């Protein structure tokens, strides 16, 4: 037999009646998420008791509830039933402090089935974290995924975490984003990974004060973990030099990184030449974000040349707010009409104007094009280039999602888009139009299109 | 949902303190259903009584960003909070930067009774 | 605020109190699956009313029940409410007949939100299928995926179905495997497919009496539908001549097929060599299943040579029951040690013997191996492999699943594998040991292993 | 779950018709819990009262497939149905080949009582 139940409530005030009504589910569900449900320390006692009798629970998510240090304590006590098998557990944004880490530390030593922990959005501080690390070092701790974003951790937390990485051959992912662990801490965490036999799968250290020189530390990491799939280093003034010293690792034959997150890292056109060398060489690199980098029209030219050459197999290019202009659009049009690997192009917050957008539409409108997702939010688009978009939606049949949110679009422009998507021949499945001003007529006209074709979601 | 309640949902939070915290936007954008299917890129909440935001519909007339002749700018700089999507956000993990401030608002109003039907922009003229 | 909920009860006996205690869930659940739970026709009305008030029903899966035509109609009325957002429906093996199809057809005319529909394992017969296609033709029908396996259809029901593909500009899946559509039938469908503007993704015609000539009709599909990702043709007498005729399609510029399922297709090394030309040319092919075909060692060699040259990015190879012997294992072994794309090899039931299994281990054990899953079931494996299968589980660090089912292994050899996987450093995630006998003592050791290392599942 | 009970659930179906139709294995394998997870490749169900199968542990001793010695071959042929995974199968969709026939069976035995804890094979000697 097989009985699997799941409940996942989010942002809902729960009455007492309704609460007792859900308690039987807490005793029965393998998957429970009460995200921002107003849970109180008090109510953490019903959960404690209910989970104590749930021989099924495998995933518990209590994100964004004021559980406090006492509440979390009551919830952790509920996981002490001998037959519990919780594999995932999130306590993100639960008002947990260093004063609660002792309890959690002594709790982790007794949950060998527990594999994932999210402590992000809590003020743990170095003492609490260091105290937890002691629990994690227990051989009974089989944690493989840990997220500590925004945990008030500084450089004084990396040696403790490095020791944990050394003690977990089974480790898969660590996230330390939004913690100023500085250049040394970053150098210390990477030291652990190097020694550690754990085949890391994803490393995230965004907004961590990662420095240019650290781009050398990370080099050793990329050129050492064939298992590494995701590397997130956004929001760090890495630099073009930083980019340069990363390539030796990426360009390593054994590197098989699939996702590289480098939005707002102090990269320009020169750093592009550096990344293009990696793109054209590594068919393993599929997703790339350079959002918020001053690539300029010269950066897009460089990226576009490589996207037009055999080799690079990039699938998603995220280049929103990169400071591109219409001058660099004739190239993307070609790629959208000559590329058979790119399915998504986030090119928001770029002054492409109607001239640039129209060029993009020309390439996607070419038979053979394959692009699936296009993001053109805040690209200074108006009704001008709207007829094109309307025809492109009838000519090209690969696009499934189009984002035109936050532009100048008019009622005459939308009407044109509508006259195209309302048709059975347009296969667009999702249109997103946040922050746009149409008439009360258009609204109903839009609300009609809904019912006439429910397979197309118009998000606004 | 009418062309007025959605405004309250997406842009109204009257009784919320002005000095928003770093959880507000991540919290409010979630509670007000602006991160369903897709993360709403930018959104502004107004810390003023509905009647105060409603009067702007009769305050100074101005042109909307799109070019339609029928927007309005408030008389006073209202206490608002801007929510900005981080360039590291990946649905459904929408992430916002919360920015509280005092600025005049520019809304579009339509119908009968005449009411706000779109939050157009905020202005720093003081 | 969201309140996503789901319930899945497979093969279970439910008392009156358990059923009574389930209904509230049928009023709130986004996903409802009640598979082989003895559902009664009368219990249908209870299902209908309950669903009538559900404000979010997306998936309704009632797999295997004797609902009968009457029962079916009941549940259907529950969905025919002003406010229904149903997207997928499963009534596979629920006793619906042609008679009960007249109502089903008309019901299908009123559910524009419905995207999928599973009617397989129901004696619909040709009359019913055509009686059903009347509704499918209604422009209010927006169905994109349809499965009709084992529906008692012949070539006749093939023109009516042909009428739907032509009518649907965005039809996604047509599964008609396990009916006798035969040569004449297969031809009718293909004409309709190319006679349609649909960007189809998957097409299934296994065990359909597909002939060698029919392969000239399919060649027209692969070339015409550039959006095609799945083409299943197993259990059809395509032969080498058939396999050869497909190629021109598999080699058409716009074809980027992802998974070619052609098990037991009468193909030999000759047709295998033809397919390898397509493999080396399309880095897009990801899943190939040539199981049950008498490929022999030559075919095993043609594949390995292909898996050791450019392009070809296939990720999973299914070559079980292919008549391979140890005389081809040095080859595959070299692929495991040198190939960086293949992640899952199914080579069960091939006379590899202990000698063959040792070679493979030599290749996998090499530094820089990427294989994640291995199936070596019923390939003459004994204790003289375990010491080696142990050396692999430690020298290799990518394998996550190893299946050694139905092999003459002794508790001695099994102890060797244990010594490896027991180690926190052994990255293995799932060991499959079906039909393997061992004492109560080893049973004890394995039941304890299964407790002391819950990240590793030892299926039996 | 005792090894004896596992043997029942996996290999005993005493109360079923011998000439099972091709619908049988797809049915039985799923209901007896041999598909949830990874499809079971080859299994065998015996159409005989439990006492007849238990009686085999007292009949002809033979070598077990894995070399162990406590296997027994029934002195008579019995009604069985073999289920084998068809190559079109792809978890969770686990379909089967149904071969209901009459053969001698071989099982391993152990414990107190001394009963079947493993189906080792079937023999065709007539």
The span from the CA of C385 to the CA of C396, in Å, is 16
Taking an 8 Å cut-off on Cβ atoms, the answer to whether D65 and C408 are in contact is yes
SS (H, E, C) chain D: CCHHHHHHHHHECCCCCCCCCCCHHHHHHHHCCCCCCCCCCEEEEECCCHHHHHHHHHCEEECCCCCCCCEEECCCCEEEEEEEECCCCECCECCEEEEEEEEEEEEEEECCCCEEEEEEEEECCC
Contact A91, A47 (CB under 8 A): no
**DSSP H helices in A292-422:** 296-307, 329-338, 353-364, 386-395, 411-421
Residues with Cβ within 8 Å of C25's Cβ and at least 6 positions away in sequence, in order, are A5, C5, C7, C32
Residue A223, classed as helix, strand or coil, is coil
Residue D77 contacts residue D101 (beta carbons within 8 Å): no
Chains D and B touch (3+ CB pairs under 8 A): no
Query: Do the chains contact at A437 and B42, CB–CB below 8 Å?
Result: no
Considering only residues 390 to 409 of chain C, which have any Cβ-Cβ distance to chain A shorter than 8 Å?
Answer: 397-398
In DSSP terms, D78 is beta-bridged to D103
- Say whether C292 and D37 touch across the interface (CB within 8 A): no
Q: Is B36 on the interface with A (CB under 8 A)?
A: yes
Residue A172 has which token pair? 């898969």
Neighbouring-strand partners of residue A117 = A89, A146
Residue C26 near residue A19, CB atoms below 8 Å: no
- B5 contact A CB<8A: no
Contact C314, C288 (CB under 8 A): yes
Q: Among this protein's residues, is D118 annotated catalytic?
A: yes
A255: left (phi over 0), alpha (psi -120 to 50) or beta: beta
| H runs (alpha helix) in C317-436 | 329-338, 353-364, 383-395, 411-421
Catalytic one of D47, D79, D104, D118: D118
3-state secondary structure of C175: strand
Chain length of chain A: 460
CB proximity C3 to B under 8 Å: no
Residue B41 marked in a binding site: yes
Give the closest residue to A185 by CA, choosing from A250, A139, A126, A242. A126
B9 is in an annotated binding site: yes
C1 touches chain B (CB under 8 A): yes
Q: Would an 8 Å CB–CB cutoff place C207 in contact with chain D?
A: yes
Q: How is residue C327 annotated by DSSP?
A: G
B100 to chain A, closest Cα gap in Å:
19
Phi, psi angle pair for C123, to nearest 5°: -75, 75
Burial (0-12, 13-18, 19+ Cβ within 10 Å), C140:
exposed
Nearest C-alpha of chain B: how many angstroms from A110? Answer: 30
In angstroms, what separates the C-alpha of A138 from chain B's closest C-alpha? 31
Mark whether D104 is an active-site residue. no
Q: With beta carbons less than 8 A apart as the criterion, state whether A237 and A265 touch.
A: yes
For residue C376 the two structure tokens come to 């070596």
Tell me how many domains chain A contains.
1
CA-only gyration radius of chain C, Å: 25
Answer whether B65 sits within 8 Å of A406, measured CB to CB.
no
| Burial of C313 per CB tally in 10 Å (0-12, 13-18, 19+) | middle
Active-site residue set of B: 11, 118
Cβ atoms within 10 Å, residue A295: 24
How many CA atoms are closer than 13 Å to the CA of D97, on its beta-carbon side?
10
Is C263 close to D88, i.e. CB distance below 8 A?
yes
How would you classify the pairing of strands D71-73 and D60-62? Answer: antiparallel
| Contacts with C320 from chain D: Cβ below 8 Å | 87
Cβ contact (<8 Å) for D87 and C264?
yes
Judged by DSSP in three states, A101 sits in helix
CB atoms C11 and D3 under 8 Å: no
β-sheet bridge partners, residue C175: C147, C204
Segments forming the whole domain that contains residue A328: 1-460
Q: How far apart are the first and last CA of chain C?
A: 42
- In this structure, what are the phi and psi dihedrals at residue C230, rounded to the nearest 5 degrees? -125, 125
Question: What is the β-pairing status of strands A259-261 and A230-232?
Answer: parallel
Q: How far is the C-alpha of A432 from the C-alpha of A406, rounded, in Å?
A: 10
State how many domains chain D has.
1
Annotated binding site of D for substrate: 6, 9, 40-44, 65, 84
List the structure tokens of A424: 């059975």
- Domain at A136, CATH number: 3.80.10.10
Closest residue in A to C172 (Cα–Cα): A427
Query: What are the distances in angstroms from CA A83 to CA A5, A33, A56, A86, A296?
Result: 18, 20, 8, 10, 58
Q: Which of A431, A433, A430, A366 is nearest to A396 (CA)?
A: A366
- Name the nearest CA neighbour of A156 among A189, A191, A119: A189
Please state whether A292 falls in left (phi above 0), alpha (psi between -120 and 50) or beta.
left
* Cβ neighbours of C443 in D, within 8 Å: 3
- Give chain D positions within 8 Å (CB) of C321: 87
HSE-CB for B29 with a 13 A CA cutoff:
30
In whole angstroms, what is the distance from residue A47 CA to residue D109 CA? 46
Beta carbons of C12 and A2 less than 8 Å apart: yes
CA-nearest of A193, A160, A53, A168 to A112 is A168
Neighbours of A126 (CB within 10 A): 17
**Shortest distance, CA D35 to any CA of chain C (angstroms):** 11
Between strands D115-123 and D96-110, the pairing is antiparallel
CATH number of the domain that residue B52 is part of:
3.10.130.10
Cα of C169 to nearest chain A Cα, Å: 6
Check: CB of residue A292 under 8 Å from CB of residue A322: yes
Resolution in A: 2.0
Structural domain boundaries enclosing D24: 1-126
Cα separation, A183 vs A210, in Å, equals: 6
- Within 8 A by CB and 6+ apart from A130, the residues are A156, A157, A160
């Amino acid at each position: 037999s097989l009985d699997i139940q799941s409940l996942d409530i989010q942002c809902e005030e729960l009455s007492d009646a309704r609460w007792a009504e859900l308690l039987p589910l807490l005793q029965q569900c393998q998957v429970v998420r009460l995200d921002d449900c107003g849970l109180t320390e008090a109510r953490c006692k019903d959960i404690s008791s209910a989970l104590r009798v749930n021989p099924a629970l495998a995933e518990l998510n209590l994100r964004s509830n004021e559980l406090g240090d006492v509440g979390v304590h009551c919830v952790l006590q509920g996981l002490q039933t001998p037959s519990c098998k919780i594999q995932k557990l999130s306590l993100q944004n639960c008002c947990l402090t260093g004063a609660g880490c002792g309890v959690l530390s002594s709790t982790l030593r007794t949950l060998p089935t527990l594999q994932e922990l999210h402590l992000s959005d809590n003020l743990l501080g170095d003492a609490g974290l260091q105290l937890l690390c002691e629990g994690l070092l227990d051989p009974q701790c089989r944690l493989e995924k840990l997220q500590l974003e925004y945990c008030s951790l500084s450089a004084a937390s990396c040696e403790p975490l490095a020791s944990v990485l050394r003690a977990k051959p089974d480790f898969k992912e660590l996230t330390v984003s939004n913690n100023d662990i500085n250049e040394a801490g970053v150098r210390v965490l990477c030291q652990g990974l190097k020694d550690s036999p754990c085949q890391l799968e994803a490393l995230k250290l965004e907004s961590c004060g990662v420095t240019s020189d650290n781009c050398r530390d990370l080099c050793g990491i990329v050129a050492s973990k064939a298992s590494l799939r995701e590397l997130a280093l956004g929001s760090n003034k890495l630099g073009d030099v930083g980019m340069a010293e990363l390539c030796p690792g990426l360009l390593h034959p054994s590197s098989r990184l699939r996702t590289l997150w480098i939005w707002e890292c102090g990269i320009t056109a020169k750093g592009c030449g550096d990344l293009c060398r990696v793109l054209r060489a590594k068919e393993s690199l599929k997703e790339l974000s350079l959002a918020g980098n001053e690539l300029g029209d010269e950066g897009a030219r460089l990226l576009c040349e490589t996207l037009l050459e055999p080799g690079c197999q990039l699938e998603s290019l995220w280049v929103k707010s990169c400071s591109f202009t219409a001058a660099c659009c004739s190239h993307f049009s070609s790629v959208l009409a000559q590329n058979r690997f790119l399915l998504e192009l986030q090119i928001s917050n770029n002054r492409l104007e109607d001239a640039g957008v129209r060029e993009l539409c020309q390439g996607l409108g070419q038979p053979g094009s394959v692009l699936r997702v296009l993001w053109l939010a805040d690209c200074d688009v108006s009704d001008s280039s709207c007829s094109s978009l309307a025809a492109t939606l009838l000519a090209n049949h690969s696009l499934r999602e189009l984002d035109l949110s936050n532009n100048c679009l008019g009622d005459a422009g939308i009407l044109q888009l509508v006259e195209s998507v309302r048709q059975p021949g347009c296969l667009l499945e999702q249109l997103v139009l946040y922050d746009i001003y149409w008439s009360e007529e258009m609204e109903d006209r839009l609300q009609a299109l809904e019912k006439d074709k429910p397979s197309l979601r118009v998000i606004s | 949902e009418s062309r007025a309640k959605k405004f309250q949902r997406q842009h109204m939070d009257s009784d919320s303190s002005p000095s928003s915290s770093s959880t507000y936007c991540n919290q409010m954008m979630r509670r007000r259903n602006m991160t369903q299917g897709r993360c709403k890129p930018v959104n502004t909440f107004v810390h003023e009584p509905l009647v105060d935001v409603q009067n702007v519909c009769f305050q100074e007339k101005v042109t909307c960003k799109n070019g339609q002749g029928n927007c309005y700018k408030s008389n006073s700089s209202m206490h608002i909070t801007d929510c900005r999507l981080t360039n590291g956000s990946r649905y459904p993990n929408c992430a916002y930067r919360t920015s509280p401030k005092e600025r005049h608002i520019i809304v579009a109003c339509e119908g009968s009774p005449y009411v706000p039907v779109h939050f157009d922009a905020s202005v720093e003229d003081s």
